Amino acid sequence: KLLEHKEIDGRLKELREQLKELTKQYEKSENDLKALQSVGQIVGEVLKQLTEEKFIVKATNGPRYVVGCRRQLDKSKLKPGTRVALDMTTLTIMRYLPREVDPLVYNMSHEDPGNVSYSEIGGLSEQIRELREVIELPLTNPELFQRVGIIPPKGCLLYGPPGTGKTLLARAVASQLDCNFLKVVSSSIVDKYIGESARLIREMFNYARDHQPCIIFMDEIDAIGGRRFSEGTSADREIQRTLMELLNQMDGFDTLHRVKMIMATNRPDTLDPALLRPGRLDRKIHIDLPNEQARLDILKIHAGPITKHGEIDYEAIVKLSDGFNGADLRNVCTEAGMFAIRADHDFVVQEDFMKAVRKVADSKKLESKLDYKPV
Amino acid sequence: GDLVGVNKDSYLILETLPTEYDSRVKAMEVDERPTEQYSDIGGLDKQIQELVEAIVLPMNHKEKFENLGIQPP
Amino acid sequence: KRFDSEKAGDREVQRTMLELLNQLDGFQPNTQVKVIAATNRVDILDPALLRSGRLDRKIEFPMPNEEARARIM
Ligand SMILES: Nc1ncnc2c1ncn2[C@@H]1O[C@H](COP(=O)(O)OP(=O)(O)OP(=O)(O)O)[C@@H](O)[C@H]1O
Ligand SMILES: [Mg+2]
């Protein structure tokens, strides 16, 4: 009846639907054209101001300039040492910025998808308490030590034979504590440039100083913590330079506060005598080979989840496995599972454990049995 | 730490590039697969069986492992 | 093997070896790549490389016997 406009109304509706996208496209084009009418600014550091309108600033590279400043900008925030942005054609102060954070330190700040807890580690229930006595209680209830009249230690190191559970304990501590944490390997902070090696460590200590509650953990300290050579070769005294820089950063002319460090190595003979001095590494922690009860605990921890069948006797396994490690017992479980894999079975019998123990036992003949102790 | 292409004069990001790898690392990947078969090796049956059950097997038959609760070597 | 000295030493290769050790097992577990290694003199090799979690299975190749020699010929 009144549909004389219905066709034209539908045409108008379709045209409006198209105009919606045409206006989204016009907006996108407007943003694209607006964005491409700006330029960057150089970054530098202020040193001091000569007069009301003249400052002297240093870029990231060498050259230093005598420059002016913007009129509207506040002049009460420009203390020496701050970071500023300058125009690229007139070199005038335009804006001040907060302190830099290195991408390396940002990556080091948070990298831990693991979620290991205290239930997965066994046999060393005393050393874990000894370690937690350093980094947990003083950071939360600090008036007790002040009441007694002492100061809690700062750092500690863990040593022992390979594969006794040091990095695992460090992972558990890092994954079960609510505080800022840094994780790094000592062999990944070295590069061929002249000053980068000693700059990275200074940067990470500055970052730790900013966020006052932090913990620093460095694995394989023997990479850069070795003894200092006499009549040594070139390209090797740079590592020593980094070493004494580190020795000065911790327990140096300026005191550290609310900062703790953890180090791990499986042979502490080669460490410098100055790095082991009390006042820098206050506590030495030993993680020795497991005992019979410790071996039984580790076996019960690792042999649990497997789809076992029949009756199991851990006493013979404990008696046979002597001088083993946690890795060795995990290997025993894996080899038992492998013997189960052969003969086409889907369950495990204690005879597989008995076979796997003696299969693992003879592979230790070709491995040295030396033990090293710090001195 | 990302790798970006920037305008030469205005200094603005124009596109994002894939992560780059060292040439020496890239040059060590195999291209022409060898043609040697298992049939031309004699007197090493135990070694072959022990090696194949730890490398090839955990790739094509992983379902045989988690069904038991054992991690591969 | 590593060692201790005070007149001169060899430490760069030891640092690369330490990084290689850290790649296997270490702080970050890896479960997508497999490692095969070959050598012909084991007594001069660092014990940390021979740990059970880092190199799990160890295979030894004996000299061929009579039948193996005939098969090879
Ligand atoms: N007490 C323990 N309880 C359970 N597992 C343990 C224990 N000690 C060691 N392990 C085993 O050790 C394996 C790896 O050990 P870890 O990485 O801690 O070695 P490590 O002692 O730091 O040696 P290194 O760094 O010198 O090679 C873990 O996967 C775990 O199964
Ligand atoms: Mg470790």
Side-chain angles (χ1 to χ4, degrees), chain A residues 10 28-375, chain B, chain C:
Chain A
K28 202 54 65 181
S29 295
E30 181 63 21
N31 319 128
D32 289 352
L33 61 84
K34 181 69 176 177
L36 295 177
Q37 293 180 357
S38 190
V39 291
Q41 310 168 355
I42 197 67
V43 178
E45 152 171 349
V46 68
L47 265 62
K48 84 170 305 186
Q49 68 172 2
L50 272 299
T51 178
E52 172 50 4
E53 302 267 1
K54 299 301 225 173
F55 297 74
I56 50 174
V57 304
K58 172 176 173 62
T60 50
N61 55 18
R64 315 172 189 185
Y65 298 106
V66 192
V67 300
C69 84
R70 198 168 94 189
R71 195 63 91 76
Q72 301 98 17
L73 189 75
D74 189 5
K75 295 180 179 66
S76 67
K77 310 290 188 295
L78 302 183
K79 309 305 289 183
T82 64
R83 185 164 59 139
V84 303
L86 316 160
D87 199 1
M88 52 194 308
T89 185
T90 61
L91 270 73
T92 73
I93 305 281
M94 301 266 298
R95 167 193 322 265
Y96 48 88
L97 299 171
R99 297 182 72 183
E100 190 148 20
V101 289
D102 212 39
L104 275 297
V105 189
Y106 175 80
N107 294 321
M108 167 200 315
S109 174
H110 39 70
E111 46 182 4
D112 186 23
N115 202 22
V116 53
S117 72
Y118 297 123
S119 311
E120 298 147 70
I121 178 171
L124 69 165
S125 53
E126 195 277 333
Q127 287 102 359
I128 180 173
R129 185 263 300 280
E130 204 152 352
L131 170 63
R132 202 196 289 195
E133 192 182 284
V134 168
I135 71 159
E136 186 207 44
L137 193 151
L139 282 195
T140 62
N141 201 358
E143 81 259 12
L144 271 63
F145 311 108
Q146 195 271 295
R147 180 151 150 79
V148 178
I150 57 164
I151 300 171
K154 276 133 53 179
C156 58
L157 73 164
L158 292 76
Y159 69 96
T164 58
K166 305 181 292 290
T167 315
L168 169 64
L169 199 154
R171 274 155 40 100
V173 167
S175 175
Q176 208 171 322
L177 194 56
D178 46 352
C179 183
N180 304 293
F181 208 89
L182 298 188
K183 299 156 280 293
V184 73
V185 184
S186 311
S187 62
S188 84
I189 67 160
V190 55
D191 73 327
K192 65 174 179 284
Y193 287 137
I194 294 90
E196 277 282 305
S197 306
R199 200 192 58 98
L200 278 157
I201 184 166
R202 205 182 302 124
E203 169 76 18
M204 66 180 288
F205 280 98
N206 289 12
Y207 175 92
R209 202 82 67 94
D210 277 347
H211 298 87
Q212 208 163 5
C214 292
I215 305 295
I216 296 90
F217 171 64
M218 314 172 65
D219 209 324
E220 313 276 39
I221 199 54
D222 48 355
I224 78 162
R227 201 197 323 280
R228 283 179 274 150
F229 290 149
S230 301
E231 61 206 60
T233 177
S234 178
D236 193 0
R237 304 169 222 142
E238 272 75 350
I239 301 178
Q240 318 204 359
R241 214 161 285 151
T242 298
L243 173 64
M244 299 150 300
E245 185 282 337
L246 165 67
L247 296 196
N248 190 179
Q249 212 64 29
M250 62 181 287
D251 194 77
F253 190 79
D254 302 349
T255 310
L256 266 174
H257 292 293
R258 313 254 295 287
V259 167
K260 323 286 191 185
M261 290 93 67
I262 299 173
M263 310 204 186
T265 176
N266 51 20
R267 56 172 312 150
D269 293 332
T270 57
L271 298 202
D272 213 32
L275 188 135
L276 300 181
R277 170 180 72 80
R280 290 201 179 89
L281 285 184
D282 300 319
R283 277 184 178 271
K284 266 78 81 176
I285 290 172
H286 193 192
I287 306 188
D288 206 0
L289 310 168
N291 284 353
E292 306 86 338
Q293 210 269 328
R295 279 201 284 275
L296 193 148
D297 291 331
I298 301 163
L299 290 174
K300 282 191 167 191
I301 289 176
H302 271 281
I306 73 173
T307 311
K308 57 208 56 165
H309 185 274
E311 192 52 89
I312 52 177
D313 179 18
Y314 291 162
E315 198 274 336
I317 303 169
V318 165
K319 287 293 183 182
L320 278 172
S321 57
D322 203 18
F324 273 24
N325 304 321
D328 290 331
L329 307 179
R330 205 218 81 246
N331 194 5
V332 162
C333 304
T334 304
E335 289 298 328
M338 219 72 84
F339 285 164
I341 282 290
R342 294 226 298 269
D344 200 74
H345 283 292
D346 59 356
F347 60 96
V348 185
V349 182
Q350 199 256 354
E351 181 74 7
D352 306 326
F353 281 74
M354 184 73 39
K355 279 182 180 179
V357 163
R358 257 192 204 89
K359 184 183 194 298
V360 174
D362 64 350
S363 75
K364 305 213 63 173
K365 285 293 152 284
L366 60 85
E367 179 171 352
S368 174
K369 295 273 191 163
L370 269 297
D371 203 328
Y372 307 104
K373 181 259 291 180
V375 54
Chain B
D2 279 347
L3 195 67
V4 289
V6 166
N7 192 299
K8 179 152 69 43
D9 283 329
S10 66
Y11 290 120
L12 269 75
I13 295 91
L14 293 182
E15 78 179 317
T16 310
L17 288 82
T19 302
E20 71 158 52
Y21 294 135
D22 196 298
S23 179
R24 296 171 283 191
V25 171
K26 281 177 173 287
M28 76 185 47
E29 183 194 27
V30 305
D31 287 340
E32 187 268 325
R33 296 278 171 157
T35 180
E36 305 209 281
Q37 209 161 358
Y38 276 120
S39 303
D40 71 347
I41 307 182
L44 284 165
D45 301 344
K46 318 292 290 299
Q47 282 85 6
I48 287 168
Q49 181 177 0
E50 195 160 355
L51 171 62
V52 69
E53 81 174 3
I55 289 304
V56 170
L57 196 67
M59 271 154 64
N60 303 326
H61 287 288
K62 64 160 318 183
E63 65 277 347
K64 212 159 293 182
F65 269 103
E66 66 264 9
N67 183 36
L68 205 56
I70 280 288
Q71 312 171 46
Chain C
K1 207 165 303 174
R2 281 178 287 179
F3 61 90
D4 169 33
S5 170
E6 59 196 61
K7 282 317 159 182
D10 182 71
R11 292 199 169 164
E12 175 75 33
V13 185
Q14 293 179 5
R15 276 188 280 104
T16 81
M17 190 255 288
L18 284 183
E19 175 80 337
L20 181 51
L21 291 183
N22 186 275
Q23 276 299 314
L24 310 167
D25 209 19
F27 204 97
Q28 278 277 8
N30 292 50
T31 43
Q32 291 86 13
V33 291
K34 278 92 171 173
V35 194
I36 312 173
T39 182
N40 68 274
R41 205 163 161 170
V42 190
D43 46 352
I44 54 178
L45 185 63
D46 195 288
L49 261 173
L50 308 182
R51 209 190 78 203
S52 285
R54 270 195 188 86
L55 281 179
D56 195 358
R57 302 193 90 150
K58 280 163 259 287
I59 319 295
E60 61 90 20
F61 285 77
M63 291 272 209
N65 53 74
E66 173 189 302
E67 283 91 6
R69 288 200 298 252
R71 181 56 197 166
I72 291 171
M73 308 203 57

